[PDB]
Amino acid sequence: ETLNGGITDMLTELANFEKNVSQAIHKYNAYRKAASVIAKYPHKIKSGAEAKKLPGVGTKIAEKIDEFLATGKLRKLEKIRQDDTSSSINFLTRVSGIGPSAARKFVDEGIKTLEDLRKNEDKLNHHQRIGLKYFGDFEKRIPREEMLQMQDIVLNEVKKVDSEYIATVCGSFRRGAESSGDMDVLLTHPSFTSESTKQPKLLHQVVEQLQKVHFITDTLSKGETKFMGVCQLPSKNDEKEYPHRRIDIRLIPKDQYYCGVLYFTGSDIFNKNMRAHALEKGFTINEYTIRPLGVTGVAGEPLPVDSEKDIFDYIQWKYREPKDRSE
DNA sequence: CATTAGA
DNA sequence: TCTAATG
Ligand SMILES: [Mn+2]
Ligand SMILES: [Mn+2]
Ligand code: NA
Ligand code: NA
């Protein structure tokens, strides 16, 4: 956690580089397990050989471990960091919609800067264009204070549309968080569950409403169950217009709402930890259900969940407010 | 690990 | 169809 801090960090620096700049899933995969292992190890790695004993660490990495232990730096790491080609990628990759693959390609064609990207908006698909457009606003965090106004709105339309809808803004926002990166709204409806062959409009009508009033200003991707767009709080009585925010809305078969809600409320840790406990307590949890465990090794049969509680009760835990689902 | 765009 | 990119 700090005892092997640099080691794991340099390791991941290295991994990440293989995957993005290079397309070496293997080495890239290599750096990763090593990094995973040395991280666990309970003692201060004092040399490559010591490290070497570890599963995943071989000669290649052991050698890096040394140079780093001796000189508080690393060649390849100095080399890479400097490398403009590789920096370029690490940068373009910041555009929503641009991933490594496209970053490489662009770069090759010589598009390295944001500006290059502008002069060449033509080579960019919708997502990435919108991504390019709001690059600035997309990088900004969401002051909770705004999150509240946003939530406040979405709820009203959702409802105005059909009183039946149930919406819950999940995420860190949910968990108290002072600011969030983007807004996740989980939605479901009684007339939509596990069997009942969809009702795509269900998702569609809200979107349309939301757009109707100008909260959604753009669409990145809309499917029959998961809409991914951009929103904005009405720039009041001018002088202060609000930054463009990322928003995601997803339809859930009402029968698996809370499971989802549980899940997207995180945190990653609260999750696992919740997950591991349900295991002892003879079950299993996942993005959509909780199935009692049978002794034959495994077992199924989706228990009936009516609120976040039921999940709790099932695994027989203490209902933990979202506020404390921090780990 | 699943849902969407795109070509 | 596959393959990229988000989360
Ligand atoms: Mn989020
Ligand atoms: Mn999200
Ligand atoms: Na070994
Ligand atoms: Na990106």
Short mmCIF file of all heavy atoms in Angstrom, two decimals, chain A residues 141 147 170-173 175 180-184 248 264, chain C residues 7, ligand 1:
data_model
loop_
_atom_site.label_atom_id
_atom_site.label_comp_id
_atom_site.label_asym_id
_atom_site.label_seq_id
_atom_site.Cartn_x
_atom_site.Cartn_y
_atom_site.Cartn_z
N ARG A 141 -15.45 18.61 -12.68
CA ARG A 141 -16.23 17.85 -11.73
C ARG A 141 -17.58 18.50 -11.54
O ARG A 141 -17.73 19.68 -11.85
CB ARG A 141 -15.46 17.78 -10.46
CG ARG A 141 -14.13 17.09 -10.69
CD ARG A 141 -14.28 15.58 -10.75
NE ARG A 141 -15.22 15.09 -9.73
CZ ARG A 141 -15.45 13.79 -9.50
NH1 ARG A 141 -14.82 12.84 -10.20
NH2 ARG A 141 -16.33 13.44 -8.54
N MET A 147 -25.67 19.12 -8.86
CA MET A 147 -26.13 17.78 -8.95
C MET A 147 -27.61 17.75 -8.46
O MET A 147 -28.47 17.14 -9.11
CB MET A 147 -25.18 16.92 -8.11
CG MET A 147 -24.04 16.25 -8.87
SD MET A 147 -24.63 15.27 -10.27
CE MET A 147 -23.85 13.64 -10.01
N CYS A 170 -28.05 7.33 -9.17
CA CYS A 170 -27.11 6.53 -8.40
C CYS A 170 -25.79 7.18 -8.28
O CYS A 170 -25.78 8.38 -8.24
CB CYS A 170 -27.06 5.07 -8.81
SG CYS A 170 -28.78 4.49 -8.74
N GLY A 171 -24.70 6.41 -8.23
CA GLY A 171 -23.36 7.03 -8.14
C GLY A 171 -22.98 7.60 -6.78
O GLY A 171 -23.70 7.44 -5.79
N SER A 172 -21.81 8.28 -6.78
CA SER A 172 -21.19 8.94 -5.63
C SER A 172 -22.11 10.01 -5.08
O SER A 172 -22.15 10.29 -3.87
CB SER A 172 -19.90 9.57 -6.04
OG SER A 172 -20.20 10.30 -7.21
N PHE A 173 -22.84 10.62 -5.99
CA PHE A 173 -23.79 11.64 -5.62
C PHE A 173 -24.71 11.09 -4.57
O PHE A 173 -25.05 11.75 -3.59
CB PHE A 173 -24.76 11.75 -6.74
CG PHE A 173 -26.04 12.38 -6.32
CD1 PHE A 173 -26.04 13.67 -5.77
CD2 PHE A 173 -27.26 11.74 -6.48
CE1 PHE A 173 -27.23 14.30 -5.40
CE2 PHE A 173 -28.45 12.37 -6.11
CZ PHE A 173 -28.45 13.65 -5.56
N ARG A 175 -24.07 8.47 -2.74
CA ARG A 175 -23.22 8.18 -1.60
C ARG A 175 -22.72 9.40 -0.85
O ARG A 175 -21.68 9.29 -0.19
CB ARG A 175 -21.98 7.46 -2.00
CG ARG A 175 -22.19 6.01 -2.23
CD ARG A 175 -20.87 5.47 -2.67
NE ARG A 175 -20.16 6.49 -3.43
CZ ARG A 175 -19.26 6.21 -4.38
NH1 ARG A 175 -18.97 4.96 -4.72
NH2 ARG A 175 -18.65 7.20 -5.02
N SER A 180 -19.43 15.15 -8.32
CA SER A 180 -19.41 13.91 -9.03
C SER A 180 -18.97 14.19 -10.44
O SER A 180 -18.99 15.34 -10.92
CB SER A 180 -20.75 13.20 -8.94
OG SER A 180 -21.49 13.81 -7.91
N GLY A 181 -18.56 13.15 -11.10
CA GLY A 181 -18.09 13.25 -12.46
C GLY A 181 -19.16 13.36 -13.50
O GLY A 181 -19.02 14.13 -14.43
N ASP A 182 -20.20 12.57 -13.32
CA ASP A 182 -21.30 12.54 -14.23
C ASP A 182 -22.50 11.98 -13.55
O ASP A 182 -22.37 11.26 -12.56
CB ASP A 182 -20.90 11.59 -15.31
CG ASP A 182 -20.85 10.19 -14.81
OD1 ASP A 182 -20.49 9.85 -13.71
OD2 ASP A 182 -21.15 9.35 -15.77
N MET A 183 -23.68 12.32 -14.05
CA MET A 183 -24.91 11.85 -13.45
C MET A 183 -25.50 10.53 -13.98
O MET A 183 -25.83 10.45 -15.14
CB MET A 183 -25.94 12.99 -13.52
CG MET A 183 -27.33 12.67 -14.04
SD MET A 183 -28.61 13.76 -13.28
CE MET A 183 -28.21 13.21 -11.59
N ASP A 184 -25.66 9.50 -13.12
CA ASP A 184 -26.26 8.21 -13.50
C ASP A 184 -27.68 8.10 -13.02
O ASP A 184 -27.94 8.00 -11.84
CB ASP A 184 -25.69 7.04 -12.71
CG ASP A 184 -24.43 6.43 -13.21
OD1 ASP A 184 -24.45 5.44 -13.93
OD2 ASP A 184 -23.36 6.98 -12.64
N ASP A 248 -26.23 9.82 -18.19
CA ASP A 248 -26.58 8.45 -18.61
C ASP A 248 -27.85 8.04 -17.91
O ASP A 248 -27.98 8.24 -16.72
CB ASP A 248 -25.57 7.32 -18.33
CG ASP A 248 -24.19 7.45 -18.90
OD1 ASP A 248 -23.92 8.15 -19.86
OD2 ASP A 248 -23.31 6.74 -18.23
N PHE A 264 -24.84 0.19 -8.62
CA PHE A 264 -24.37 1.45 -9.15
C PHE A 264 -24.22 2.47 -8.04
O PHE A 264 -23.78 3.60 -8.29
CB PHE A 264 -25.19 2.05 -10.26
CG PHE A 264 -24.98 1.33 -11.52
CD1 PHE A 264 -26.01 0.56 -12.04
CD2 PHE A 264 -23.78 1.45 -12.19
CE1 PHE A 264 -25.83 -0.13 -13.25
CE2 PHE A 264 -23.59 0.77 -13.40
CZ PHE A 264 -24.61 -0.02 -13.92
P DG C 7 -18.06 7.53 -19.96
OP1 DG C 7 -18.87 8.79 -19.99
OP2 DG C 7 -16.61 7.61 -19.72
"O5'" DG C 7 -18.72 6.61 -18.84
"C5'" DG C 7 -18.90 5.27 -19.12
"C4'" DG C 7 -19.96 4.66 -18.27
"O4'" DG C 7 -19.94 3.25 -18.56
"C3'" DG C 7 -19.67 4.78 -16.78
"O3'" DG C 7 -20.85 4.62 -16.07
"C2'" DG C 7 -18.76 3.60 -16.52
"C1'" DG C 7 -19.16 2.60 -17.59
N9 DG C 7 -17.99 2.12 -18.23
C8 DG C 7 -16.80 2.63 -18.60
N7 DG C 7 -16.04 1.77 -19.17
C5 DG C 7 -16.79 0.62 -19.15
C6 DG C 7 -16.47 -0.64 -19.63
O6 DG C 7 -15.42 -0.98 -20.17
N1 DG C 7 -17.49 -1.54 -19.42
C2 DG C 7 -18.69 -1.23 -18.82
N2 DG C 7 -19.57 -2.25 -18.71
N3 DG C 7 -19.00 -0.03 -18.36
C4 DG C 7 -17.99 0.83 -18.57
MN MN D 1 -20.56 8.57 -11.85
#
